Design a protein around this ligand. Structure first.
Ligand SMILES: NC(=S)c1ccc[n+]([C@@H]2O[C@H](COP(=O)([O-])OP(=O)(O)OC[C@H]3O[C@@H](n4cnc5c(N)ncnc54)[C@H](OP(=O)(O)O)[C@@H]3O)[C@@H](O)[C@H]2O)c1
Length: 182
C-alpha cells in the first residue's frame, strides 16, 4: 500500500507569448521531438522575429540530441538558423543561470535533472543541458511521457517549469503567429 504523486503545471499559448515577450535572454534546447514534428521552420521564423526585437535568442544542442550525431544542427541549418546562434552544450551550459527563458522543444532525456539529482538513476552522471537553472522553463512536448531512456524527468514537477502540451510543430506555428501579431 504505497503511493507517491507529482504536480506539474500547464500554461496556455497566450501565457506562453507573455513569458516570451517578457524575457530578454532566451535559450532554446531542441531534441528528438522537434525532428519528428519537423518544427525547425516555425521555431526558426520565431527566433528571427525575436532577434529583430533586440532579444537574445540562442539554441543549446546536446551532443546526443535526436537520433543521429549533430542531427539537430542539420535541421536547424536547413531552416535558416544562423550557425552563430546555434551553440553546443559545453559552450552554453554555463549560461543557464543567467537566462530568463528556456524553451525546451521536443527534448527530454537531454534536459533530465535526474542525472544530477538521483544517484540511483540509470542516467546518473550523464551530462545534461541544465535548463532548470534558468529563471523560467517552458517544456514543449505532447505530454509528460518519457523519452528514449524511458525514464521520468524531474524538471516536469519543478516550480519554475511550465508544460505547454501539443505537437512541437502545431505549438511552434501558433507561437510564431501570435508573436507576429505583436
Ligand atoms: N543523437 C544520437 S547519436 C542518439 C542515438 C541513439 C539514442 N539516442 C538517445 O536519444 C535521446 C535523445 O534525447 P532527446 O532529448 O532528443 O530525446 P527523448 O528524450 O528521446 O525526447 C523525445 C521527446 O520529444 C517528445 N516528442 C516526440 N514527438 C513529439 C512531437 N511530435 N511533438 C512534440 N514533442 C514530441 C517526447 O515526448 P511526448 O511523447 O510527450 O511528446 C519525448 O519525450 C537520448 O537519451 C540519447 O541518448 C541519441
Amino acid at each position: 500500500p504505497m503511493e507517491i504523486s507529482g504536480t506539474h503545471t500547464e500554461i496556455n499559448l497566450d501565457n506562453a507569448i507573455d513569458m516570451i515577450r517578457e524575457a530578454n535572454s532566451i535559450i532554446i534546447t531542441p531534441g528528438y521531438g522537434l525532428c519528428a514534428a519537423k518544427a525547425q521552420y516555425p521555431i526558426a521564423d520565431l527566433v528571427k522575429m525575436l532577434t529583430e526585437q533586440g532579444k537574445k535568442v540562442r539554441f543549446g544542442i546536446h551532443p546526443v540530441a535526436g537520433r543521429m550525431p549533430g542531427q539537430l544542427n542539420v535541421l536547424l541549418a536547413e531552416a535558416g538558423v544562423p550557425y552563430d546562434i546555434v551553440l553546443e552544450m559545453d559552450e552554453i551550459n554555463h549560461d543557464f543561470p543567467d537566462t530568463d527563458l528556456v524553451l525546451v522543444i521536443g527534448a527530454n532525456d537531454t534536459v533530465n535533472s535526474a542525472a544530477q539529482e538521483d544517484p540511483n538513476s540509470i542516467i546518473a552522471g550523464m551530462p545534461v543541458l541544465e535548463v532548470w537553472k534558468s529563471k523560467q522553463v517552458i517544456v514543449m512536448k505532447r505530454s509528460l511521457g518519457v523519452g528514449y531512456a524511458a525514464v521520468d524527468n524531474p524538471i516536469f514537477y519543478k516550480p519554475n517549469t511550465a508544460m505547454l502540451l501539443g505537437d512541437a510543430k502545431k505549438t511552434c506555428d501558433a507561437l510564431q503567429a501570435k508573436v507576429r501579431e505583436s
